[PDB]
Paper text:
To identify barriers that restrict neutralization breadth, we performed single memory B cell sorting with the [name]-[name] spike protein to mine the memory B cell repertoire of a COVID-19 convalescent individual (“C1”). From C1 peripheral blood mononuclear cells, using a prefusion stabilized [name]-[name] spike protein (S2P), we cloned 17 cross-reactive antibodies. Among A3, C6, and A6, only A3 competed with binding of an ACE2-Fc fusion protein, suggesting that A3 blocks cellular attachment. On the basis of its epitope, in addition to retaining activity against all variants we tested, A3 would also have activity against emergent and preemergent [name]-[name]-2 variants; these include a variant sequenced from travelers from Tanzania that contains the E484KRBD, T478RRBD, and R346KRBD mutations, and B.1.621 (Mu), a variant detected early in 2021 in Colombia that has since spread internationally and contains the E484KRBD, N501YRBD, and R346KRBD mutations. Despite the presence of the N-linked glycan, A3 potently neutralized RaTG13 virus pseudotype (neutralization IC50 value of 21 ng ml−1), suggesting that A3 neutralization breadth extends to preemergent coronaviruses that are closely related to [name]-[name]-2.
Through adaptive evolution, these variants acquire mutations in the spike (S) protein receptor binding domain (RBD) that binds the cellular receptor human angiotensin-converting enzyme 2 (ACE2) (1–3). The RBD is the primary target of neutralizing antibodies in naturally acquired or vaccine-elicited humoral immunity. We demonstrate mechanisms through which the [name]-[name]-2 receptor binding domain (RBD) can tolerate large numbers of simultaneous antibody escape mutations and show that pseudotypes containing up to seven mutations, as opposed to the one to three found in previously studied variants of concern, are more resistant to neutralization by therapeutic antibodies and serum from vaccine recipients. We identify an antibody that binds the RBD core to neutralize pseudotypes for all tested variants but show that the RBD can acquire an N-linked glycan to escape neutralization.
Author numbering:
A (entry chain L): 1 to 95, 95A, 95B, 96 to 212
B (entry chain H): 1 to 52, 52A, 53 to 82, 82A, 82B, 82C, 83 to 100, 100A, ...
Write the structure that this text describes.
């Protein structure tokens, strides 16, 4: 079985700059390697096959090179729609199969931007149903790496939150993150101070947003 | 026009079955090898199965061997995927794809892809969401779209009149087996008294349509 490893997992570049994506195979695949592009919410599409052959209709700005175990996909001059995920791919014979790399995502590099943080208590409508969701919003920050810690009456929470992050914004190149702390109505009513503490490269000290009630 | 169109996706209980179809148009279907490839939500691509142009041999990923069967009907230009004994880990968008090679048993690349169809395997049943307000010189407000199944939901603000500063987040799958997502918008603090904010949520699987006014 062949394993394909793509690096870096995320490539941070500017529009128009040259993108160089790498794919390393565990053992030789000769020149039998393909690259696919997947734009967010869309099906993948073939870009290159046989290491350097551009698929039909693919613009000349996409080019592939390499052989054996070292392959590169070059995008000579990035367009807005090119900030997408790219996968390399080959065949395996033992067992027979098709192997994909784990993907490299291209993002627009911009200046560091600290998040603007907001906390929302559970609505009275939700409390009438037996559960309490507390939401913390980290808005328009860069880079994507951010940490949210929930604290209830000054006690760090663990195992009772979930979060997700938006795709990079097309206009300002930032990300936003939403975290939800879930408690039963009975547990929510036993505590007073609800706080979300945010750490990020753009913050010299963690920022806390909080409210009292429950 | 050259294309592949999948059908038959939906929700299925663990241990049960589902059969997908893929209608091919615009090329000599009987001259190409055909594949199924899947993508679990937020994960990478995983090849599932291949069938030779004349249907005389097939191969499968070890993850689906024995449970899934790829087949084709060259007289109807249709490819099938029979999925039996389904498990939660089979939840994915399933794509049918044409092999690049013409009348060649050596399979290697996917040169044409369908649109994909979502298959969700879970003990949960189809359910519309509950929508709760996230009440508010910049202010933030939103809507929490909780406890729905399966994906997806769409959210708009003020019937589409409000788009700037809107962020609709990817859903999370809760331990209950139901999804939850938030949608927020940042506005000038002075607009809280002059403008009304309503989130419009749609969940097509349950035919749910909700309008929720979000007040300070």
């Amino acid at each position: 079985e062949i394993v394909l490893t793509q690096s870096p997992a995320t490539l941070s570049l500017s529009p128009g700059e040259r993108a160089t994506l790498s794919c390393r195979a565990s053992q030789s695949v000769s020149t039998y390697l393909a690259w696919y592009q997947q734009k967010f919410g869309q099906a993948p599409r073939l870009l290159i096959y046989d290491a350097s052959n551009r698929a039909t209709g693919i613009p000349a700005r996409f080019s592939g090179s390499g052989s054996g175990t070292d392959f590169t996909l070059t995008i000579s001059s990035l367009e807005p729609e090119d900030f997408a995920v790219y996968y390399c791919q080959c065949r395996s014979n033992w067992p027979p199969g098709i192997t994909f790399g784990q993907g490299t995502r291209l993002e627009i590099k911009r200046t560091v931007a600290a998040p603007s943080v907001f906390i929302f208590p559970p609505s009275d409508e939700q409390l009438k149903s037996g559960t309490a969701s507390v939401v913390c919003l980290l808005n328009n920050f860069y880079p994507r790496e951010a940490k949210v810690q929930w604290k209830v009456d000054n006690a760090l929470q663990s195992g009772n939150s979930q979060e997700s992050v938006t795709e990079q914004d097309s206009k300002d190149s930032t990300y936003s993150l939403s975290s939800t702390l879930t408690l039963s109505k009975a547990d929510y009513e036993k505590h007073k101070v609800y706080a979300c503490e945010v750490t990020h490269q753009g913050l010299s000290s963690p920022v806390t947003k909080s409210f009292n009630r429950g | 026009q050259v294309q592949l169109v999948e059908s038959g996706g939906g929700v299925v209980q663990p241990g049960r079955s589902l059969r997908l179809s893929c209608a091919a148009s615009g090329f000599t279907f009987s001259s190409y090898g055909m594949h199924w490839v899947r993508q679990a939500p937020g994960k990478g691509l995983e090849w599932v199965a291949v069938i030779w142009y004349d249907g005389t041999n097939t191969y499968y990923a070890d993850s689906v061997k024995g449970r899934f069967t790829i087949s084709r009907d060259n007289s109807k230009n249709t490819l099938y995927l029979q999925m039996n004994s389904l498990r939660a880990e089979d939840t994915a968008v399933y794509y049918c794809a044409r092999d690049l090679a013409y009348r060649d048993y050596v399979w290697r690349y996917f040169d044409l892809w369908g649109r994909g169809t979502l298959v969700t395997v879970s003990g949960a049943s189809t359910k519309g969401p509950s929508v709760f307000p996230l009440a508010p010189g910049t202010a933030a407000l939103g809507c929490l779209v909780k406890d729905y199944f399966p994906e997806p939901v769409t959210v708009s603000w003020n019937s589409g009149a409000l788009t700037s500063g809107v962020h609709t987040f990817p859903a999370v799958l809760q331990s209950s087996g139901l999804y939850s997502l938030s949608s927020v918008v940042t506005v000038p603090s002075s607009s809280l008294g002059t403008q009304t904010y309503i989130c419009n949520v749609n969940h097509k699987p349950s035919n749910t349509k909700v309008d929720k006014r979000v007040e300070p």
